[PDB]
Amino acid sequence: PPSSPPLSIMGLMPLTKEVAKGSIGRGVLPAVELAIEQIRNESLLRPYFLDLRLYDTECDNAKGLKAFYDAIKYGPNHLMVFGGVCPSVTSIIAESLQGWNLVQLSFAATTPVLADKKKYPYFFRTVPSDNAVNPAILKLLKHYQWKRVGTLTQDVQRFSEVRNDLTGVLYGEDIEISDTESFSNDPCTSVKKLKGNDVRIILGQFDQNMAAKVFCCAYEENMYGSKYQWIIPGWYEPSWWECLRKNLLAAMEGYIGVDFEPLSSKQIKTISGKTPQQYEREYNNKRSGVGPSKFHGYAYDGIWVIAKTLQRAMETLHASSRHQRIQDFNYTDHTLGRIILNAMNETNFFGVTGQVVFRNGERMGTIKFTQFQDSREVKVGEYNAVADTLEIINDTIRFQGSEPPKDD
Amino acid sequence: RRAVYIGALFPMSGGWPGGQACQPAVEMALEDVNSRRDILPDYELKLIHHDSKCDPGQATKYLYELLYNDPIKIILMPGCSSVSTLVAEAARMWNLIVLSYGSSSPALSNRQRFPTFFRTHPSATLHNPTRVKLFEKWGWKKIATIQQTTEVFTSTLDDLEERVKEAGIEITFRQSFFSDPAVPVKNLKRQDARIIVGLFYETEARKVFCEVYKERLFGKKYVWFLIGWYADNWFKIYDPSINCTVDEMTEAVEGHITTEIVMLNPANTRSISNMTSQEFVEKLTKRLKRHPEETGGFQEAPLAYDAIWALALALNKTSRLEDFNYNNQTITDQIYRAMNSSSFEGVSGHVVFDASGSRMAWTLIEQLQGGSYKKIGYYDSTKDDLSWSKTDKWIGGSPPADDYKDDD
Ligand SMILES: *[C@@H]1O[C@H](CO)[C@@H](O)[C@H](O)[C@H]1NC(C)=O
Ligand SMILES: NC[C@H](CC(=O)O)c1ccc(Cl)cc1
C-alpha cells in the first residue's frame, strides 16, 4: 500500500557468484522471501511493512565494512541489521553496532567469541554457536558413563574458546579431563602424549584441514578401534575426507561429530502455522537457480524474530510517540536501540529450527550428533538445550567392540 | 598555504593507552613541520583526531566520520595493532595510505593484505631473536606459551615457533584465551611448565598473574617472559576483575623477564628536527600534564613524532595535494613510492620503510626485582651482540631448569 510505511532492515551477507560463500546468501534468500511473504499477507506489522534491503559483503572484511558504511550513508533509516555470515566480517559489524544504536541478528555466524556481551552487546544469533556443543557432549558422556576424557585443541581462538568453555560446563559434574593437549600445525606430538596418558575418550576442537592430520596421527599411534571414542566438530564439509585413504578411514571409523541441527524433527505447527516438514518442501519449491543452504531454517526463523521484535517495539499506549520515534530514527537514538534490544531479548516462539529463545544473545537450540560409519555420516542423536535432554536414535550408533569403550 | 588533512586515531585508554603521549608528540611534530619553509611551503598539515580507546568497535565509528565527512584526508594515522589492522585492511576501498606510529602486529608486514600500509613502530618479531638468545644463554630447550588471542600476539607466536625450531628449541605446551586466562593457567600448572612466554596487553596481564598467584605458578622453578610495554607499577594497580591483593600480585610477578625495543637514539646527535633525543624528552615532558612514568605511550612517542616527519617529507617529494580523492589511485601510488624511498634521521634513529621488520637493531631486557624493574641487558640481533649488565638475580644464585632431568 502507498500509505504503508517501511520498517527498514539492513541485510548483510555474501551474494556474488565471484565468492564461494555467495552460495550461502543466495541459498537462504528463498527462506527469507517465504517468511517476508507470509508476514505481509498476514499484515502482522500493520500499517507498516518489513523493508529488508540487501547489501553484499562479498565475504570480505574491506568490502563488508564499506557495504555497511554505504548502507548507513546512502540507504534508508535501518532499524536493525540482519545477517553476518563470514565470521571476520560479522565480528567487524557486530563490535561496532553501538555506534549506530543497531541491534544485529545473524543466522549463520557460529564462532564462540561473538557470545562476549562486553564486546558484542547488541548482537543476537538464531544459530547455536560452536560452544553449544559442550552441554550436549556432557549429556553424551553421562549417557555412556564416560567419566574420564582427554582434549585435543588447535591453538586458534575459535577452538581454544570452545575448549576453555568446556571446563565450565563440566564443573560440578563428575568428569575428569585427565590430559589437555594443544597443537599449532602438527598434532602428532600431542596425539602421542594422549596415547602415553592412556586417554580413551577424546574431545577434539580443530579445523577441517587439521582433522585429516589428527586421524593420520591416531592411525600411526593405533588410537582407534573398539578401545577409543573420538568426539569432534560436525560442521566440516560433507565428504571432507575425500596417510593412504584406507588407513585414514580405519582411524575415522565410529568418530562422533557434533553440530547444530538444521531443522526441527518435531511435526508440530510452528508460528507460521506450518510444520518444519511443510516449510522444508515450500523452501525446496521456492529456490530456483541455487543449491540449498544448511542455514535456511535459521534465516527463516531469523525473519520471524525481527517481525516479532518490531511488533513488541510497537506495543505501547504511547502509540503516536512510538511511531514518530521509529520514523525519526537516524542511528542516534539510544532509547529506540534499547527498546529494540529489550524486545529481541523477550523472543520466545516455536520456529522451524525448534523453540526460538535466547540466553544473553545466544540461541538455546538443538544440537545434532552424527557418527562416521563407512564413508557416511549417520545422524545418531539430538540434544535440546532448553530441556537439557539427549535423545539417542535407536539402532544407529554403533561400537566396534561388544560394548561401548571404557574411559580407562 | 592550502590545508592538507590527516585523519588520526589515538588510544587514550584500552589495551595500549599510547595516545596519552603520542597525541602531544604528533602536535609537536606538526608545529615543527609547518614552521619549516623548506619542507611543504605551499601546504599546511592539519590534524583531525579521535580517541579510539584502543577499540576496533569505537574506531569503526570514527573511521566512518573521517571518510564520509569533508574535508578529504590524504592519510590515516592509527595507533593500536587492532585498530591499525582494521583501518589498513579497509583503506584500499578509499585508496588511502595508512601510517601507524604504534602498531607492532607482525601480520601487518603482509603487503597483499595491507597494500597501502607503513609504520614507524618495529614489528613485534624483534622480541623473538632476543627471547631465543636468552633461552640459549640459560640452556632451555623446552618452553611453554600463553597468549591472549589478538592477532598482534598470535602472529608474534607464529614467528617465535619458527625461530625456536631453527635453534633446536621446542614449544612443548600452548594455551590461549580471549578474555579469561583461568583455564590456560590451570593447565600450565598441571603440565609442569617451567619457562613460559606470556603475550597479552597490560589489562590481561593482571588477570593472568592473579591466576598465577592462585595456582602458585611462580617461585624458584618458574620463569615468566613478558612484553616490556606495561606501566612500571602495572601489577600494583587496583583491578575490579581481579580478587588478588597488591601484595599477592607483587609476589606472583617477582623475578619475571621483559623485552622491549629501544625507540629513542641513545647517542647525543641532532636529528632532522635539529633536536637531540634528550631535548625531545624534556620538550614532551613540558607538554604533558602527568609525569612520563604516568603517561601511556611515552616510550613510543618518538615514533609518533617521526611518523609526521616521514609523511611531511613524502608529501614534499610528491609536491597537486588539494586534488586528492578516494576514487583515484594516482596520488596514492606516488605518495606510496615517496614513503617507500624514505631515508632520514629522526628522534628514533634512521627512519626507513621496508615491510617485514620495521628497522632498528636493539631490544632492552629487564627483570622485576623487589617490585621494581632493573635493566639486565640489551640485544642486537643484526650483529648478534648481547650486552650483559650482570645485574640479574635468581633464587639460589642461578636460573632454574626447563624440566626435571633426574627420572632415569
Ligand atoms: C532479558 O531476558 C531475560 C530472560 O527472560 C531476563 O531475565 C532479563 O531480565 C532480560 N534483560 C533485560 C530486561 O534487561
Ligand atoms: N608498543 C606499543 C604496542 C601497541 C600495539 O601493537 O597495539 C604494544 C605491543 C604490545 C603490548 Cl603488550 C603493548 C603495546
Side-chain angles (χ1 to χ4, degrees), chain A residues 60-62 69-70 73 95 99 155 157 161 164 177 180 184 193, chain B residues 56 60-61 63 68 89 92 149 161 172 174 176 178 190-191:
Chain A
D60 180 67
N61 292 349
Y69 281 169
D70 285 345
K73 181 76 181 196
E95 66 192 356
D155 196 47
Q157 179 180 286
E161 281 305 296
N164 298 342
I177 313 265
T180 298
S184 51
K193 284 189 229 189
Chain B
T60 299
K61 175 70 165 78
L63 179 64
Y68 288 81
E89 262 188 313
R92 68 181 172 108
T149 55
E161 276 252 46
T172 65
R174 295 151 193 90
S176 291
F178 169 69
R190 265 156 46 174
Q191 292 291 322

PDB file of all heavy atoms in Angstrom, chain A residues 60-62 69-70 73 95 99 155 157 161 164 177 180 184 193, chain B residues 56 60-61 63 68 89 92 149 161 172 174 176 178 190-191:
ATOM      1  N   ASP A  60      34.119 -10.452   2.597  1.00  0.00           N
ATOM      2  CA  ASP A  60      35.416  -9.769   2.629  1.00  0.00           C
ATOM      3  C   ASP A  60      35.397  -8.648   3.654  1.00  0.00           C
ATOM      4  O   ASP A  60      34.471  -7.842   3.637  1.00  0.00           O
ATOM      5  CB  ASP A  60      35.738  -9.224   1.218  1.00  0.00           C
ATOM      6  CG  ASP A  60      37.063  -8.500   1.139  1.00  0.00           C
ATOM      7  OD1 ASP A  60      38.112  -9.164   1.294  1.00  0.00           O
ATOM      8  OD2 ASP A  60      37.054  -7.260   1.035  1.00  0.00           O
ATOM      9  N   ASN A  61      36.392  -8.592   4.553  1.00  0.00           N
ATOM     10  CA  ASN A  61      36.442  -7.523   5.565  1.00  0.00           C
ATOM     11  C   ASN A  61      36.284  -6.098   5.004  1.00  0.00           C
ATOM     12  O   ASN A  61      35.434  -5.339   5.500  1.00  0.00           O
ATOM     13  CB  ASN A  61      37.731  -7.618   6.385  1.00  0.00           C
ATOM     14  CG  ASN A  61      37.781  -8.833   7.265  1.00  0.00           C
ATOM     15  OD1 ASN A  61      36.792  -9.536   7.443  1.00  0.00           O
ATOM     16  ND2 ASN A  61      38.942  -9.101   7.849  1.00  0.00           N
ATOM     17  N   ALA A  62      37.085  -5.738   3.964  1.00  0.00           N
ATOM     18  CA  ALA A  62      37.044  -4.381   3.409  1.00  0.00           C
ATOM     19  C   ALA A  62      35.742  -4.098   2.672  1.00  0.00           C
ATOM     20  O   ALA A  62      35.143  -3.045   2.907  1.00  0.00           O
ATOM     21  CB  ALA A  62      38.256  -4.109   2.518  1.00  0.00           C
ATOM     22  N   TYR A  69      29.012   0.792   5.676  1.00  0.00           N
ATOM     23  CA  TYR A  69      29.165   2.258   5.679  1.00  0.00           C
ATOM     24  C   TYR A  69      28.265   2.906   4.613  1.00  0.00           C
ATOM     25  O   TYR A  69      27.638   3.944   4.868  1.00  0.00           O
ATOM     26  CB  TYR A  69      30.624   2.639   5.380  1.00  0.00           C
ATOM     27  CG  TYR A  69      31.618   2.532   6.514  1.00  0.00           C
ATOM     28  CD1 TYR A  69      32.983   2.639   6.277  1.00  0.00           C
ATOM     29  CD2 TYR A  69      31.198   2.337   7.832  1.00  0.00           C
ATOM     30  CE1 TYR A  69      33.904   2.617   7.319  1.00  0.00           C
ATOM     31  CE2 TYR A  69      32.118   2.285   8.881  1.00  0.00           C
ATOM     32  CZ  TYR A  69      33.473   2.417   8.614  1.00  0.00           C
ATOM     33  OH  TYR A  69      34.418   2.382   9.624  1.00  0.00           O
ATOM     34  N   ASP A  70      28.221   2.296   3.421  1.00  0.00           N
ATOM     35  CA  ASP A  70      27.420   2.801   2.294  1.00  0.00           C
ATOM     36  C   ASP A  70      25.929   2.647   2.556  1.00  0.00           C
ATOM     37  O   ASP A  70      25.147   3.525   2.158  1.00  0.00           O
ATOM     38  CB  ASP A  70      27.820   2.134   0.965  1.00  0.00           C
ATOM     39  CG  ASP A  70      29.140   2.635   0.390  1.00  0.00           C
ATOM     40  OD1 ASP A  70      29.618   3.683   0.834  1.00  0.00           O
ATOM     41  OD2 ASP A  70      29.640   2.016  -0.547  1.00  0.00           O
ATOM     42  N   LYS A  73      25.295   5.616   4.958  1.00  0.00           N
ATOM     43  CA  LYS A  73      25.353   6.893   4.273  1.00  0.00           C
ATOM     44  C   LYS A  73      24.223   7.121   3.256  1.00  0.00           C
ATOM     45  O   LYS A  73      23.639   8.198   3.240  1.00  0.00           O
ATOM     46  CB  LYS A  73      26.729   7.067   3.601  1.00  0.00           C
ATOM     47  CG  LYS A  73      26.887   8.417   2.873  1.00  0.00           C
ATOM     48  CD  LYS A  73      27.111   9.584   3.836  1.00  0.00           C
ATOM     49  CE  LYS A  73      27.250  10.898   3.092  1.00  0.00           C
ATOM     50  NZ  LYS A  73      27.831  11.971   3.953  1.00  0.00           N
ATOM     51  N   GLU A  95      30.865  -5.719  16.518  1.00  0.00           N
ATOM     52  CA  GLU A  95      31.524  -4.926  17.589  1.00  0.00           C
ATOM     53  C   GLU A  95      31.225  -3.437  17.517  1.00  0.00           C
ATOM     54  O   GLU A  95      31.423  -2.711  18.493  1.00  0.00           O
ATOM     55  CB  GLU A  95      33.051  -5.149  17.600  1.00  0.00           C
ATOM     56  CG  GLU A  95      33.793  -4.626  16.378  1.00  0.00           C
ATOM     57  CD  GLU A  95      35.229  -5.119  16.277  1.00  0.00           C
ATOM     58  OE1 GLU A  95      35.695  -5.815  17.211  1.00  0.00           O
ATOM     59  OE2 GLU A  95      35.896  -4.791  15.269  1.00  0.00           O
ATOM     60  N   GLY A  99      27.687   2.153  18.021  1.00  0.00           N
ATOM     61  CA  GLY A  99      27.966   3.437  17.389  1.00  0.00           C
ATOM     62  C   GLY A  99      26.783   3.956  16.580  1.00  0.00           C
ATOM     63  O   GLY A  99      26.642   5.158  16.402  1.00  0.00           O
ATOM     64  N   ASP A 155      45.495 -24.575  18.558  1.00  0.00           N
ATOM     65  CA  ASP A 155      45.769 -23.304  19.251  1.00  0.00           C
ATOM     66  C   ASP A 155      45.395 -22.067  18.408  1.00  0.00           C
ATOM     67  O   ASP A 155      46.243 -21.243  18.063  1.00  0.00           O
ATOM     68  CB  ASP A 155      47.231 -23.246  19.753  1.00  0.00           C
ATOM     69  CG  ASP A 155      47.477 -22.145  20.809  1.00  0.00           C
ATOM     70  OD1 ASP A 155      46.677 -22.047  21.759  1.00  0.00           O
ATOM     71  OD2 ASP A 155      48.475 -21.395  20.676  1.00  0.00           O
ATOM     72  N   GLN A 157      41.898 -19.193  18.220  1.00  0.00           N
ATOM     73  CA  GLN A 157      40.815 -18.639  19.037  1.00  0.00           C
ATOM     74  C   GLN A 157      39.499 -19.429  19.013  1.00  0.00           C
ATOM     75  O   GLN A 157      38.976 -19.757  20.080  1.00  0.00           O
ATOM     76  CB  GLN A 157      40.571 -17.157  18.674  1.00  0.00           C
ATOM     77  CG  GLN A 157      39.431 -16.523  19.481  1.00  0.00           C
ATOM     78  CD  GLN A 157      39.220 -15.083  19.097  1.00  0.00           C
ATOM     79  OE1 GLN A 157      40.008 -14.206  19.445  1.00  0.00           O
ATOM     80  NE2 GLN A 157      38.205 -14.822  18.295  1.00  0.00           N
ATOM     81  N   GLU A 161      38.639 -21.264  22.545  1.00  0.00           N
ATOM     82  CA  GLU A 161      37.486 -20.736  23.285  1.00  0.00           C
ATOM     83  C   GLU A 161      36.467 -21.836  23.593  1.00  0.00           C
ATOM     84  O   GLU A 161      35.904 -21.854  24.689  1.00  0.00           O
ATOM     85  CB  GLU A 161      36.858 -19.511  22.606  1.00  0.00           C
ATOM     86  CG  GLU A 161      37.686 -18.267  22.909  1.00  0.00           C
ATOM     87  CD  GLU A 161      37.894 -18.001  24.397  1.00  0.00           C
ATOM     88  OE1 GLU A 161      36.885 -17.739  25.091  1.00  0.00           O
ATOM     89  OE2 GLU A 161      39.053 -18.053  24.871  1.00  0.00           O
ATOM     90  N   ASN A 164      38.134 -23.843  26.401  1.00  0.00           N
ATOM     91  CA  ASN A 164      38.047 -23.123  27.689  1.00  0.00           C
ATOM     92  C   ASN A 164      36.629 -23.151  28.251  1.00  0.00           C
ATOM     93  O   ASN A 164      36.451 -23.351  29.452  1.00  0.00           O
ATOM     94  CB  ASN A 164      38.619 -21.697  27.610  1.00  0.00           C
ATOM     95  CG  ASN A 164      40.105 -21.650  27.263  1.00  0.00           C
ATOM     96  OD1 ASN A 164      40.824 -22.631  27.383  1.00  0.00           O
ATOM     97  ND2 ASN A 164      40.570 -20.555  26.711  1.00  0.00           N
ATOM     98  N   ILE A 177      39.107 -34.254  33.133  1.00  0.00           N
ATOM     99  CA  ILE A 177      39.892 -34.001  31.934  1.00  0.00           C
ATOM    100  C   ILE A 177      41.256 -34.395  32.429  1.00  0.00           C
ATOM    101  O   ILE A 177      41.917 -33.589  33.088  1.00  0.00           O
ATOM    102  CB  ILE A 177      39.931 -32.531  31.446  1.00  0.00           C
ATOM    103  CG1 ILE A 177      38.531 -31.878  31.421  1.00  0.00           C
ATOM    104  CG2 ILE A 177      40.664 -32.462  30.092  1.00  0.00           C
ATOM    105  CD1 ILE A 177      37.781 -31.885  30.170  1.00  0.00           C
ATOM    106  N   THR A 180      45.140 -32.543  28.782  1.00  0.00           N
ATOM    107  CA  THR A 180      44.803 -31.447  27.882  1.00  0.00           C
ATOM    108  C   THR A 180      45.966 -31.279  26.951  1.00  0.00           C
ATOM    109  O   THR A 180      47.094 -31.053  27.412  1.00  0.00           O
ATOM    110  CB  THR A 180      44.475 -30.178  28.687  1.00  0.00           C
ATOM    111  OG1 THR A 180      43.344 -30.438  29.514  1.00  0.00           O
ATOM    112  CG2 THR A 180      44.194 -28.966  27.791  1.00  0.00           C
ATOM    113  N   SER A 184      49.698 -26.466  17.087  1.00  0.00           N
ATOM    114  CA  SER A 184      49.502 -25.372  16.140  1.00  0.00           C
ATOM    115  C   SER A 184      49.386 -25.959  14.736  1.00  0.00           C
ATOM    116  O   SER A 184      48.323 -25.887  14.150  1.00  0.00           O
ATOM    117  CB  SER A 184      50.634 -24.351  16.237  1.00  0.00           C
ATOM    118  OG  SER A 184      51.902 -24.985  16.153  1.00  0.00           O
ATOM    119  N   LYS A 193      51.201 -37.836  23.121  1.00  0.00           N
ATOM    120  CA  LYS A 193      51.063 -37.539  24.554  1.00  0.00           C
ATOM    121  C   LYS A 193      49.758 -38.085  25.122  1.00  0.00           C
ATOM    122  O   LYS A 193      49.765 -38.647  26.225  1.00  0.00           O
ATOM    123  CB  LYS A 193      51.229 -36.038  24.847  1.00  0.00           C
ATOM    124  CG  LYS A 193      52.692 -35.571  24.802  1.00  0.00           C
ATOM    125  CD  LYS A 193      52.876 -34.138  25.292  1.00  0.00           C
ATOM    126  CE  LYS A 193      53.714 -33.312  24.341  1.00  0.00           C
ATOM    127  NZ  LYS A 193      54.068 -31.976  24.909  1.00  0.00           N
TER     128      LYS A 193
ATOM    129  N   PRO B  56      38.561  -1.532  18.255  1.00  0.00           N
ATOM    130  CA  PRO B  56      38.129  -1.536  16.841  1.00  0.00           C
ATOM    131  C   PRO B  56      36.670  -1.146  16.627  1.00  0.00           C
ATOM    132  O   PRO B  56      36.379  -0.513  15.621  1.00  0.00           O
ATOM    133  CB  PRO B  56      38.448  -2.957  16.358  1.00  0.00           C
ATOM    134  CG  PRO B  56      39.366  -3.513  17.361  1.00  0.00           C
ATOM    135  CD  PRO B  56      39.074  -2.852  18.665  1.00  0.00           C
ATOM    136  N   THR B  60      35.707   2.040  14.403  1.00  0.00           N
ATOM    137  CA  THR B  60      34.842   1.859  13.217  1.00  0.00           C
ATOM    138  C   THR B  60      33.903   3.054  13.073  1.00  0.00           C
ATOM    139  O   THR B  60      33.684   3.540  11.950  1.00  0.00           O
ATOM    140  CB  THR B  60      34.116   0.520  13.293  1.00  0.00           C
ATOM    141  OG1 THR B  60      35.112  -0.508  13.302  1.00  0.00           O
ATOM    142  CG2 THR B  60      33.190   0.275  12.082  1.00  0.00           C
ATOM    143  N   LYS B  61      33.388   3.552  14.211  1.00  0.00           N
ATOM    144  CA  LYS B  61      32.506   4.728  14.175  1.00  0.00           C
ATOM    145  C   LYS B  61      33.297   5.956  13.715  1.00  0.00           C
ATOM    146  O   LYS B  61      32.829   6.685  12.845  1.00  0.00           O
ATOM    147  CB  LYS B  61      31.819   4.962  15.540  1.00  0.00           C
ATOM    148  CG  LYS B  61      30.961   6.247  15.613  1.00  0.00           C
ATOM    149  CD  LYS B  61      29.680   6.160  14.770  1.00  0.00           C
ATOM    150  CE  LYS B  61      28.664   7.240  15.098  1.00  0.00           C
ATOM    151  NZ  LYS B  61      29.033   8.539  14.495  1.00  0.00           N
ATOM    152  N   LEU B  63      36.137   5.999  11.987  1.00  0.00           N
ATOM    153  CA  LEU B  63      36.629   5.822  10.624  1.00  0.00           C
ATOM    154  C   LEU B  63      35.523   6.260   9.678  1.00  0.00           C
ATOM    155  O   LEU B  63      35.794   6.965   8.701  1.00  0.00           O
ATOM    156  CB  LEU B  63      37.060   4.360  10.349  1.00  0.00           C
ATOM    157  CG  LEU B  63      37.586   4.057   8.929  1.00  0.00           C
ATOM    158  CD1 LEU B  63      38.879   4.831   8.637  1.00  0.00           C
ATOM    159  CD2 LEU B  63      37.833   2.537   8.731  1.00  0.00           C
ATOM    160  N   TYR B  68      33.479   9.795   5.527  1.00  0.00           N
ATOM    161  CA  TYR B  68      32.189  10.243   4.990  1.00  0.00           C
ATOM    162  C   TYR B  68      31.820  11.692   5.331  1.00  0.00           C
ATOM    163  O   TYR B  68      30.691  12.113   5.101  1.00  0.00           O
ATOM    164  CB  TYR B  68      31.095   9.256   5.412  1.00  0.00           C
ATOM    165  CG  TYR B  68      31.206   7.943   4.665  1.00  0.00           C
ATOM    166  CD1 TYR B  68      32.120   6.966   5.059  1.00  0.00           C
ATOM    167  CD2 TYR B  68      30.416   7.685   3.551  1.00  0.00           C
ATOM    168  CE1 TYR B  68      32.234   5.763   4.368  1.00  0.00           C
ATOM    169  CE2 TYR B  68      30.531   6.490   2.845  1.00  0.00           C
ATOM    170  CZ  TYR B  68      31.417   5.516   3.278  1.00  0.00           C
ATOM    171  OH  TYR B  68      31.556   4.353   2.567  1.00  0.00           O
ATOM    172  N   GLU B  89      43.297  -2.767   6.507  1.00  0.00           N
ATOM    173  CA  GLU B  89      42.585  -3.731   5.658  1.00  0.00           C
ATOM    174  C   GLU B  89      41.544  -2.997   4.819  1.00  0.00           C
ATOM    175  O   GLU B  89      41.310  -3.373   3.669  1.00  0.00           O
ATOM    176  CB  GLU B  89      41.769  -4.691   6.523  1.00  0.00           C
ATOM    177  CG  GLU B  89      42.421  -6.012   6.798  1.00  0.00           C
ATOM    178  CD  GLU B  89      41.466  -6.955   7.496  1.00  0.00           C
ATOM    179  OE1 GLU B  89      40.800  -6.540   8.477  1.00  0.00           O
ATOM    180  OE2 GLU B  89      41.349  -8.102   7.012  1.00  0.00           O
ATOM    181  N   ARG B  92      42.181   0.267   1.301  1.00  0.00           N
ATOM    182  CA  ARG B  92      42.251   0.091  -0.169  1.00  0.00           C
ATOM    183  C   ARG B  92      40.971   0.565  -0.879  1.00  0.00           C
ATOM    184  O   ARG B  92      41.051   1.058  -2.009  1.00  0.00           O
ATOM    185  CB  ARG B  92      42.597  -1.347  -0.594  1.00  0.00           C
ATOM    186  CG  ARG B  92      41.524  -2.369  -0.294  1.00  0.00           C
ATOM    187  CD  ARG B  92      41.932  -3.759  -0.698  1.00  0.00           C
ATOM    188  NE  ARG B  92      40.956  -4.733  -0.214  1.00  0.00           N
ATOM    189  CZ  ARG B  92      40.101  -5.377  -0.997  1.00  0.00           C
ATOM    190  NH1 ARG B  92      40.103  -5.166  -2.307  1.00  0.00           N
ATOM    191  NH2 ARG B  92      39.228  -6.228  -0.477  1.00  0.00           N
ATOM    192  N   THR B 149      44.240 -13.840  22.450  1.00  0.00           N
ATOM    193  CA  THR B 149      44.067 -14.045  21.014  1.00  0.00           C
ATOM    194  C   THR B 149      43.795 -12.787  20.154  1.00  0.00           C
ATOM    195  O   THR B 149      42.988 -12.846  19.232  1.00  0.00           O
ATOM    196  CB  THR B 149      43.005 -15.141  20.777  1.00  0.00           C
ATOM    197  OG1 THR B 149      41.780 -14.826  21.445  1.00  0.00           O
ATOM    198  CG2 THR B 149      43.476 -16.491  21.256  1.00  0.00           C
ATOM    199  N   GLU B 161      57.609 -19.599  16.961  1.00  0.00           N
ATOM    200  CA  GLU B 161      57.625 -21.027  16.657  1.00  0.00           C
ATOM    201  C   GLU B 161      58.680 -21.335  15.597  1.00  0.00           C
ATOM    202  O   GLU B 161      59.377 -22.310  15.727  1.00  0.00           O
ATOM    203  CB  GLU B 161      56.240 -21.502  16.181  1.00  0.00           C
ATOM    204  CG  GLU B 161      55.298 -21.834  17.326  1.00  0.00           C
ATOM    205  CD  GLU B 161      55.001 -23.307  17.541  1.00  0.00           C
ATOM    206  OE1 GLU B 161      55.946 -24.130  17.529  1.00  0.00           O
ATOM    207  OE2 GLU B 161      53.814 -23.629  17.772  1.00  0.00           O
ATOM    208  N   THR B 172      56.683 -26.864  24.071  1.00  0.00           N
ATOM    209  CA  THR B 172      56.099 -28.140  24.499  1.00  0.00           C
ATOM    210  C   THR B 172      54.638 -28.028  24.953  1.00  0.00           C
ATOM    211  O   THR B 172      53.982 -29.055  25.122  1.00  0.00           O
ATOM    212  CB  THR B 172      56.976 -28.801  25.554  1.00  0.00           C
ATOM    213  OG1 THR B 172      56.982 -27.959  26.716  1.00  0.00           O
ATOM    214  CG2 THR B 172      58.412 -29.065  25.045  1.00  0.00           C
ATOM    215  N   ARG B 174      51.080 -25.036  24.666  1.00  0.00           N
ATOM    216  CA  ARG B 174      50.492 -23.764  24.213  1.00  0.00           C
ATOM    217  C   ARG B 174      49.090 -23.657  24.780  1.00  0.00           C
ATOM    218  O   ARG B 174      48.330 -24.645  24.795  1.00  0.00           O
ATOM    219  CB  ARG B 174      50.281 -23.750  22.711  1.00  0.00           C
ATOM    220  CG  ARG B 174      51.497 -23.810  21.865  1.00  0.00           C
ATOM    221  CD  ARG B 174      51.105 -24.500  20.577  1.00  0.00           C
ATOM    222  NE  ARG B 174      52.299 -24.876  19.831  1.00  0.00           N
ATOM    223  CZ  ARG B 174      52.932 -26.036  19.963  1.00  0.00           C
ATOM    224  NH1 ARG B 174      52.464 -26.967  20.788  1.00  0.00           N
ATOM    225  NH2 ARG B 174      54.028 -26.279  19.263  1.00  0.00           N
ATOM    226  N   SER B 176      45.786 -20.522  25.011  1.00  0.00           N
ATOM    227  CA  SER B 176      45.292 -19.244  24.512  1.00  0.00           C
ATOM    228  C   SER B 176      43.984 -18.941  25.181  1.00  0.00           C
ATOM    229  O   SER B 176      43.285 -19.864  25.602  1.00  0.00           O
ATOM    230  CB  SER B 176      45.006 -19.344  23.023  1.00  0.00           C
ATOM    231  OG  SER B 176      46.189 -19.475  22.256  1.00  0.00           O
ATOM    232  N   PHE B 178      40.670 -15.653  25.153  1.00  0.00           N
ATOM    233  CA  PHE B 178      40.160 -14.410  24.602  1.00  0.00           C
ATOM    234  C   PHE B 178      40.130 -13.355  25.706  1.00  0.00           C
ATOM    235  O   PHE B 178      40.634 -12.237  25.509  1.00  0.00           O
ATOM    236  CB  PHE B 178      38.755 -14.602  23.944  1.00  0.00           C
ATOM    237  CG  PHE B 178      38.101 -13.286  23.606  1.00  0.00           C
ATOM    238  CD1 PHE B 178      38.612 -12.476  22.597  1.00  0.00           C
ATOM    239  CD2 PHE B 178      37.027 -12.817  24.353  1.00  0.00           C
ATOM    240  CE1 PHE B 178      38.052 -11.222  22.342  1.00  0.00           C
ATOM    241  CE2 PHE B 178      36.470 -11.570  24.094  1.00  0.00           C
ATOM    242  CZ  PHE B 178      36.980 -10.786  23.092  1.00  0.00           C
ATOM    243  N   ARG B 190      49.277 -27.868  35.772  1.00  0.00           N
ATOM    244  CA  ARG B 190      49.129 -29.317  35.656  1.00  0.00           C
ATOM    245  C   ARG B 190      50.133 -29.970  34.703  1.00  0.00           C
ATOM    246  O   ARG B 190      50.539 -31.106  34.955  1.00  0.00           O
ATOM    247  CB  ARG B 190      47.684 -29.690  35.277  1.00  0.00           C
ATOM    248  CG  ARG B 190      46.832 -30.030  36.495  1.00  0.00           C
ATOM    249  CD  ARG B 190      45.339 -29.839  36.275  1.00  0.00           C
ATOM    250  NE  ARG B 190      44.872 -30.398  35.002  1.00  0.00           N
ATOM    251  CZ  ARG B 190      43.597 -30.460  34.630  1.00  0.00           C
ATOM    252  NH1 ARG B 190      42.639 -30.023  35.441  1.00  0.00           N
ATOM    253  NH2 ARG B 190      43.268 -30.970  33.450  1.00  0.00           N
ATOM    254  N   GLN B 191      50.588 -29.245  33.652  1.00  0.00           N
ATOM    255  CA  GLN B 191      51.580 -29.764  32.693  1.00  0.00           C
ATOM    256  C   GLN B 191      53.023 -29.644  33.198  1.00  0.00           C
ATOM    257  O   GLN B 191      53.953 -30.107  32.530  1.00  0.00           O
ATOM    258  CB  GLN B 191      51.472 -28.995  31.356  1.00  0.00           C
ATOM    259  CG  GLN B 191      50.185 -29.275  30.600  1.00  0.00           C
ATOM    260  CD  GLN B 191      50.064 -30.661  30.041  1.00  0.00           C
ATOM    261  OE1 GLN B 191      51.029 -31.258  29.561  1.00  0.00           O
ATOM    262  NE2 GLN B 191      48.852 -31.182  30.056  1.00  0.00           N
TER     263      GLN B 191
END
